[PDB]
Structures are given as structure tokens and as C-alpha cells.
Design a protein around this nucleic acid. Structure first.
Ligand SMILES: [Mg+2]
Lengths: 53, 267, 47, 45, 48
DNA sequence: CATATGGTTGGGTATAATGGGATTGTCTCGGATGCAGG
DNA sequence: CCTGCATCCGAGAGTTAGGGAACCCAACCATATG
């Protein structure tokens, strides 16, 4: 997040936009408390049988 | 990028084939490595499976993930034996490497065999993977001393693995292997009696043609148990709006009338 | 019985939706005014 | 030890029963599904 | 007929292949006891 | 609780075999993006 | 280095009704019956 905040001082507009877009995801993860590694599945949940009868 | 069949075919094609000399050498090294590993097990007194596993893990390297503590301790103990014994360990390493190289080089026979089993409830890649398992079995059990080519012994195991996988996994409701064979025999007999009779035979004909111990009721039960389930999402009508499961009522939960009757009865 | 109908509860389709969202590895929770969990399954799915 | 599973006239239908057909297992040319002993059809006008 | 390219022996056999539905006089079919009609299809002609 | 039967499951076959099978008549719109110029 | 400019890919496209392919051999737990 600190690297991206410093990246937001560049005169370029496209680079600044890219830094902002990356920061959206970084800050969402930081505020929500979700860990990024949870986006990779290790245990697959299994739906109850009565909903897949 | 996509189409994993192309990727797998390219990856197998990146390994060159083998000549008679290379094949015989690899078989000799695997056999002497197995003999050497059993000799090490006898010398050290440990279980042969465990020393096989530690030798294989040390060969495969850190890249491939019993924990590292036991493998290191037993390896170092194994690297402590006096001379005329550690030579066996070296032969075991070379034999394990030979086994890997042999499987890697003969993977293409698995694809060649498995390409003729499509359309039977298993995808192409699944058939190849089960053929690979059968190839591993054949490699492990192969005996070169008989001077026969490896593919002759490998084909039988590959076919056995593919057939067993088809019998085990092709059906939503699993039917045992002997019962699956019974169903296949029933189908073959009925097909031959259909061709011969110029019409679909009745159940008595099939029962007579199977042999003693078969009556029409048993044939009917066998065909009933051979029925596969249909999808609840089968589209009904041309428009994409009606599914089969939309026409099936729930018979488990009590209806409002039934619940009211029970409550009034309790009252 | 001649009385008026009582107040309704959570429909079963919302429970089905919650279960199908859990199968996609998404944690859906219903909360009260103080952000505490509210169990809409009556306790039948809690170990 | 048995219950009613009879065929009844649905709401809004009815009339005069004009024809009855019964097909049983083993009858020449009859091909029932496995497990189904017999089928009965009623034509009402 | 089964013809061996080498020997030259011939094995002639008549084999039953199944059933083909028959069109009635009015132009329909009886499939599973129900009357059915095959609808003609309009499509792009092959060519250049 | 004690077996005895069928049903179930694991193991085996030795001439030689060595890279698969389909693809097709919509239309617009908005964002992501690699390529060209200055 | 910036910018614009085709280029690619993905997501949309009204409601209600009615409709429907080997075979064999031997050991081993499970269940049935007394
Ligand atoms: Mg509809």
C-alpha cells in the first residue's frame, strides 16, 4: 500500500490510474480483514444432498 | 493454451523414444536396484517399503514435497554403512532413476491404447491417466529376463487398468465389477439374439441363452438395476425455460392439510 | 380454526440461496442491529 | 397393510367411459418397462 | 462379403441391421404409438 | 452371540504394438489492451 | 516517454400459459439365519 501511495505522485495519468486500481483491491483486503491466500481453495465445500437430490 | 489434450501430447512428445539397448539397460537397472534395496533392508533391518520411500524421496529432490526428519536420519544412517554395501544403495538409486525414465519414455503407448475406449462414460484424459497407472504397474512387475519386449507385457496391464476404471467410475450409482460384467454379457447375448432372430428377443430367449441359473424374472431385475438416472436439469421444450425437475413434486415434507390434521388430532 | 393468520418467517428460498452461496466458499451471515450473528437455520446446521 | 393408490377423475373433467384397454406382461408385441406388471388405459368421452 | 486380400477366400453373409420407420399413406409416422410429422428445413444451398 | 453363505473386491493374463477429434447465419456496447505515431 | 486507434473479450437481449464395447481366479468382510 505504501509503494502504491508513492506511485500515486507520478506525472503520468495512466500509471496513476493503475496504481489507484491496484490500491482499491489492496485497501479492500486490508479493511475487510480477509486474507488474500483464501482466494485459493484447499477444502471444497459440499452442498447438502437435499438441494442436489 | 487451452485444449489440455494438445498440451499433454506435446509434453509426452518432448521425450524421445527408446531402442532395444536402452530398454534392456533400464530394465536391468530397475531389477538390480530392487535387489539392492532388499539387500540394504536386510543389512539394516528396517522395513523395505520405508527405505524405498526414502530413496525415492531423495531422488525426486526437494521440489517434490513421512517428514524430512525421518528421511534425513535414515538416509544418513544409510550413508554410514561400510563398503561393499553402500554400492547396493548406489545401484538402488540408479534403478529408481531407470524406473522413472522407463515410464516417462513409454507413456505414449498408454495414449495409443486408451484412444480406442472413448464414448463409454470416461473422458479421454481420464482413460490416459488410468492407462498411466496400469503402465506403472507393468513397469514395476516387468521381468526382462524373458527377452520379451516391454510393450507386450505393458499392454495387458494398461487394458486392465482402463477396464477397471471404466467399471468403477462410469456410473452415477456404482454397480460392482461382477454385476457390471453380468450386464455386459446380458447386452452382448441380447444383441446377438436380436441379430439372429431378426427382431428384439423376449426375456425368455435371453434367459435361455445365458445358461443354467437364469430365468425371465432375473433378467428383468438385471435390466432394471442397469438403468441410469436422468438429469433433473433435462430441458423440456424448445425454449430455455422448462427443466425436468420442475415437474417432480416433493413427497417428503408434510402438506399443510396433513400438519393441520396432526395438530387437531393432538388437540 | 377461525383465527387470523400469524406473522410470516424467512422463506426457504433464502435458505437455499445461503446454502448455495456457501458451496462457492462465500460466508453469508445475517446480523442484528449490534452486528451480532443471527442464526436463521434455527440451530440445525451448527456443530 | 395396504393403502389407496387408485386412479380418479381430475377436477373439471369427466364424462362417459367409452373404452378400456389392458396390457399385461408377456402379451404378444407388448413391451413394458422393467418392473411394470401391467398398464390400464381408459377412454372417456 | 468378407474378402481376404491375401488368400482370396470370400465369406458371404446377410446381416440384419435393425428397423426403419415407415411413412403412412397420408404422410406421417407412427413413433412409439404416436403420430408424428417431419418438418422440412430451409437452409443455405451448398456451392460457391 | 455364532457361524455359513453369496456378494464383493483385489490380482492376473508375456509376439508386437508408441501424438486425438471437432470446428460454421446476431447485434451492440463497454472496458482492457497491445501497437502505431508523435 | 506520452497519446490515440483499432482489437479482443465478455455480458445483455419483456411477461404469462403449456410442455416431458474382456475374462477369469481366489481371498474377505457383510449379512442372514439359529
Ligand atoms: Mg415459461
Amino acid at each position: 500500500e505504501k509503494e502504491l501511495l508513492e506511485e500515486m505522485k507520478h506525472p503520468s495519468r495512466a500509471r496513476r490510474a493503475k496504481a489507484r486500481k491496484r490500491l482499491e483491491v489492496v485497501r479492500a483486503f486490508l479493511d475487510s480483514g480477509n486474507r488474500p491466500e483464501w482466494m485459493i481453495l484447499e477444502a471444497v465445500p459440499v452442498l447438502p444432498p437435499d438441494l442436489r437430490p | 493454451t487451452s485444449d489440455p489434450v494438445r498440451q499433454y501430447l506435446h509434453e509426452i512428445g518432448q521425450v524421445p523414444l527408446l531402442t532395444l539397448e536402452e530398454e534392456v539397460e533400464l530394465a536391468r537397472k530397475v531389477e538390480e536396484g530392487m535387489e539392492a534395496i532388499k539387500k540394504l533392508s536386510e543389512i539394516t533391518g528396517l522395513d523395505p517399503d520405508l527405505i524405498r520411500e526414502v530413496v525415492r524421496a531423495k531422488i525426486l529432490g526437494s521440489a517434490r514435497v513421512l517428514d524430512p526428519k525421518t528421511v534425513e536420519e535414515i538416509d544418513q544412517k544409510l550413508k554410514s554403512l561400510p563398503k561393499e554395501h553402500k554400492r547396493y544403495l548406489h545401484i538402488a538409486r540408479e534403478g529408481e532413476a531407470a524406473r522413472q525414465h522407463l515410464i516417462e519414455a513409454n507413456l505414449r503407448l498408454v495414449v495409443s491404447i486408451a484412444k480406442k475406449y472413448t464414448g463409454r462414460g470416461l473422458s479421454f484424459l481420464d482413460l490416459i491417466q488410468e492407462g498411466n497407472q496400469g503402465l506403472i504397474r507393468a513397469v514395476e512387475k516387468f521381468e526382462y529376463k524373458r527377452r520379451f519386449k516391454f510393450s507386450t507385457y505393458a499392454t495387458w496391464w494398461i487394458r486392465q487398468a482402463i477396464n477397471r476404471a471404466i467399471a468403477d467410475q462410469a456410473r452415477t450409482i456404482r454397480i460392482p465389477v461382477h454385476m457390471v460384467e453380468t450386464i455386459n454379457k446380458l447386452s452382448r447375448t441380447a444383441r446377438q439374439l436380436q441379430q439372429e432372430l431378426g427382431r428384439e428377443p423376449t426375456y425368455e430367449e435371453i434367459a435361455e441363452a445365458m445358461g443354467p441359473g437364469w430365468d425371465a424374472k432375473r433378467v428383468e431385475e438385471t435390466l432394471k438395476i442397469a438403468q441410469e438416472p436422468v438429469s433433473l436439469e433435462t430441458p423440456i421444450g424448445d425454449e430455455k425455460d422448462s427443466f425436468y425437475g420442475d415437474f417432480i413434486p416433493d413427497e417428503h415434507l408434510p402438506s399443510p392439510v396433513d400438519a393441520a390434521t396432526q395438530s387437531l388430532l393432538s388437540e | 380454526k377461525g383465527e387470523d393468520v400469524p406473522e410470516p418467517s424467512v422463506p426457504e428460498s433464502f435458505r437455499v440461496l445461503v446454502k448455495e452461496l456457501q458451496a462457492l466458499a462465500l460466508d453469508v451471515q445475517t446480523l442484528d442491529e449490534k452486528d451480532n450473528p443471527v442464526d436463521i437455520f434455527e440451530g440445525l446446521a451448527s456443530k | 397393510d395396504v393403502k389407496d393408490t387408485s386412479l380418479r377423475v381430475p377436477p373439471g373433467e369427466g364424462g362417459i367411459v367409452v373404452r378400456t384397454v389392458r396390457l399385461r406382461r408377456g402379451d404378444p408385441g407388448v413391451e413394458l418397462k422393467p418392473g411394470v406388471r401391467e398398464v390400464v388405459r381408459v377412454y372417456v368421452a | 462379403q468378407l474378402i481376404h486380400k491375401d488368400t482370396g477366400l470370400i465369406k458371404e453373409d446377410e446381416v440384419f441391421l435393425g428397423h426403419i420407420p415407415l411413412m403412412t399413406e397420408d404422410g406421417s409416422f407412427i413413433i412409439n404409438g404416436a403420430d408424428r410429422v417431419i418438418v422440412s428445413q430451409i437452409h443455405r444451398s451448398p456451392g460457391v
